[PDB]
Amino acid sequence: MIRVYIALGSNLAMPLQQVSAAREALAHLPRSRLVACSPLYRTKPLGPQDQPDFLNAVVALDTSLPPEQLLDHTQAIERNQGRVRKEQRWGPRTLDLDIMLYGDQVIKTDRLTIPHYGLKAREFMLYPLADIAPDLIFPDGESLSECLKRVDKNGLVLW
Amino acid sequence: MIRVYIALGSNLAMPLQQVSAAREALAHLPRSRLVACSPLYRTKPLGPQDQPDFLNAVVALDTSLPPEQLLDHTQAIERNQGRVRKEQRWGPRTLDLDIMLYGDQVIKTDRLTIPHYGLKAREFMLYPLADIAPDLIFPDGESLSECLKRVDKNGLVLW
Numbered sequence: 001m002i003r004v005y006i007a008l009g010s011n012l013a014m015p016l017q018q019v020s021a022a023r024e025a026l027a028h029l030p031r032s033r034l035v036a037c038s039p040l041y042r043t044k045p046l047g048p049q050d051q052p053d054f055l056n057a058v059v060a061l062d063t064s065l066p067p068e069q070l071l072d073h074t075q076a077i078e079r080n081q082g083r084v085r086k087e088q089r090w091g092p093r094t095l096d097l098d099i100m101l102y103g104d105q106v107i108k109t110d111r112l113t114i115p116h117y118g119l120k121a122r123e124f125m126l127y128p129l130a131d132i133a134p135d136l137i138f139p140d141g142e143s144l145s146e147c148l149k150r151v152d153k154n155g156l157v158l159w
Numbered sequence: 160m161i162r163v164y165i166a167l168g169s170n171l172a173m174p175l176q177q178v179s180a181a182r183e184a185l186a187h188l189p190r191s192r193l194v195a196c197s198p199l200y201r202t203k204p205l206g207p208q209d210q211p212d213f214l215n216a217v218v219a220l221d222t223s224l225p226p227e228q229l230l231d232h233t234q235a236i237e238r239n240q241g242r243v244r245k246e247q248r249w250g251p252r253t254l255d256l257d258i259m260l261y262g263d264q265v266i267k268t269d270r271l272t273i274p275h276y277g278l279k280a281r282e283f284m285l286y287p288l289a290d291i292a293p294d295l296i297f298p299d300g301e302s303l304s305e306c307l308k309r310v311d312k313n314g315l316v317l318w
């Protein structure tokens with residue numbers, strides 16, 4: 001199977017339940033196996049708008065699902081959790097699942113760009129990733145440990 | 160000023176309103192000037208979910224605003240139009256403004272990736288772009304004309 005890293009994020013007032021349900025939903029994906037979970041982190045939301053802090057985590061999963069099938073599945077999870085709360089686009093985010101890495105491949109389609117475009121600049125993705133995959137080396141050759149030296153925690157703390 | 164290309168999209172039942180309001184909002188952006196508008200196109204929505212067709216267009220503008228400021232402004236416009244409708248995240252999209260190109264620069268930050276990651280695979284971005292910038296050459300050196308040979312209209316027709 002292919003090793004995949006998914007970023008979970010939620011900045012609802014009480015985001016804990018969203019992330020836990022998501023980790024559950026992910027572990028039960030067709031032809032996939034949950035491999036490891038990172039600690040949970042409280043992070044500062046990007047953008048000029050003032051909103052609730054984010055709850056961020058990263059999960060490692062092994063899968064046989066191709067990129068697009070994987071995306072249909074993660075979006076289905078986001079969609080189920082969002083619909084339940086009649087989620088407004090411009091307000092707190094219920095659950096955001098970003099495919100950070102898909103094996104050591106570079107995916108570029110009308111619906112995907114993997115590695116996630118902001119992985120190497122987002123502490124809320126890099127730090128949790130380093131907790132479960134410290135010796136990881138990105139598809140472009142740069143190692144995660146090197147990226148960490150370039151990206152500050154930026155206020156990131158344990159949830 | 161820097162030449163920028165913005166993708167406008169909306170797949171509400173009555174999307175004309177949104178795109179027209181957006182074109183005007185863009186034309187009145189600080190230290191920016193509207194340069195040209197592409198024709199309006201009816202396009203097929205990406206993704207497994209079944210929803211209304213999209214209304215897509217491309218606008219060219221000159222600006223003195225740096226990437227981050229430009230983004231803050233386009234999101235402000237999306238937000239203004241979406242808020243009023245209490246827009247649901249998992250329903251039709253009121254207005255989506257994607258920065259397609261920024262001069263001939265490659266911008267990669269925690270909030271931005273330009274050229275837009277899907278530009279080269281999306282007929283709804285490429286065709287309207289070719290209407291107003293047929294001889295354009297992407298930052299990587301490939302011409303839009305050559306890129307067009309690889310991407311099909313995919314059901315794209317005039318609105």
Ligand SMILES: Nc1ncnc2c1ncn2[C@@H]1O[C@H](COP(=O)(O)CP(=O)(O)OP(=O)(O)O)[C@@H](O)[C@H]1O
Pocket residue numbers: 096097098099100110111112113114115116117118270
């Ligand atoms: N690696 C990736 N993981 C998940 N979705 C991706 C992706 N690369 C591109 N996408 C696309 O991103 C689209 C919009 O997803 P959203 O979750 O609304 C963006 P976001 O995660 O809120 O912002 P961000 O990309 O700045 O983190 C999806 O419909 C999907 O097609």
Ligand SMILES: Nc1ncnc2c1ncn2[C@@H]1O[C@H](COP(=O)(O)CP(=O)(O)OP(=O)(O)O)[C@@H](O)[C@H]1O
Pocket residue numbers: 111255256257258259269270271272273274275277
């Ligand atoms: N070129 C670009 N233009 C606009 N937003 C961009 C961008 N590159 C990255 N983004 C980021 O994308 C984030 C989510 O924007 P959304 O509009 O919700 C994604 P979308 O446009 O719905 O899907 P898409 O990226 O697959 O087209 C923004 O908050 C912004 O920081």
Ligand SMILES: Nc1nc2c(c(=O)[nH]1)N=C(CO)CN2
Pocket residue numbers: 008009010043044045046047054056096124
């Ligand atoms: N701290 C923090 N900020 C964000 C995050 C996120 O996961 N964490 N996701 C975003 C868009 O998906 C925008 N901003």
Ligand SMILES: Nc1nc2c(c(=O)[nH]1)N=C(CO)CN2
Pocket residue numbers: 167168169202203204205206213215255283
């Ligand atoms: N036809 C069409 N499909 C889409 C579009 C779009 O503008 N047009 N935008 C998307 C996400 O921003 C997803 N899908």
Ligand SMILES: [Mg+2]
Pocket residue numbers: 009096098
């Ligand atoms: Mg995200």
Ligand SMILES: [Mg+2]
Pocket residue numbers: 096097098
């Ligand atoms: Mg996402």
Ligand SMILES: [Mg+2]
Pocket residue numbers: 255256257
């Ligand atoms: Mg957008």
Ligand SMILES: [Mg+2]
Pocket residue numbers: 168255256257
């Ligand atoms: Mg878009």
